[PDB]
Amino acid sequence: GIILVMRSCPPSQLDFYFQQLGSLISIVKQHIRPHVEKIYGVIREFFPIIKLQITIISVIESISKALEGEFKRFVPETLTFFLDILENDQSNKRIVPIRILKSLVTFGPNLEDYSHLIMPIVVRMTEYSAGSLKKISIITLGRLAKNINLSEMSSRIVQALVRILNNGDRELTKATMNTLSLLLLQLGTDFVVFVPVINKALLRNRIQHSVYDQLVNKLLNNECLPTNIIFDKENEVPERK
Fold first, then answer.
1. How far apart are CA 122 and CA 129, in angstroms?
2. Which DSSP state fits 233?
3. Which of 7, 35, 194, 200 shows a CA-CA span of 20 to 30 A to 74?
4. Residue 144, Cβ neighbours under 10 Å: how many?
5. d(CA 18, CA 61)
């Protein structure tokens, strides 16, 4: 299995270990679970790809292998995945963000906190819409993970949807990513939602909340409403072979 740490580490041999990984969906482990950290706490320039077989080089092999657990193993494995992200994330690299959205929904959800407080950090970066999709799905592949309803952030993620007064480069998609951000993770809450009527100093994030969510939302105002998470953006993508 320790013969596959033994192994010269050119990346040609590593890519046999990046395919040895997919050998072990076979596992479910069991106890290779110190060695997983052993040769990525290493910490190479191959990166958490969807590649060429449904198996990841080499972090999101572990999420799709160990299924969920141990997360006790993935909190230091949760300092050596955001230690990267900090200069791993520009405007172009959208290539580890697709690899941080891909580690996102796989691991979810998930006691995980500086994960739930440094994301935050990657969204709260005002000028970070620059690959548009990237921080759009920071708002699908956050919400899908239901861990974000356990919310402290509501009022800092209210101060991350009018600090953009709609028009950053979302922008009729800040309109749909905020109707996805709120519903599933929603209320058991009032003051987050008497606020928006005011932020109407905007005209896209106002007239996709004025026919989708402020209407399920003229709707949620006296009654909530379940499912309809089979509408906005559906894709929950099963695992079989």
1. 11
2. S
3. 7
4. 20
5. 8
Q: What is the DSSP string of 169-202?
A: ---SSHHHHTTT---TT--S------------SS
Residue 87: which H helix or E strand, with range?
none
Q: Which amino acid is at 59?
A: V
How many whole angstroms separate alpha carbon 112 and alpha carbon 115?
6
Record the tokens describing residue 182, joined without a space.
């709120």
Amino acid found at 110: N
Resolution in A: 7.9
Residue 189's identity, in one-letter code, is T
Q: Is 107 helix (H, G, I), strand (E, B) or coil?
A: helix
For the range 56-60, what are the long-range contacts, defined as Cβ-Cβ under 8 Å and sequence gap of 24 or more? 56/21, 56/102, 57/15, 57/18, 57/21, 58/17, 58/18, 58/21, 59/103, 60/99, 60/102, 60/103, 60/106, 60/107
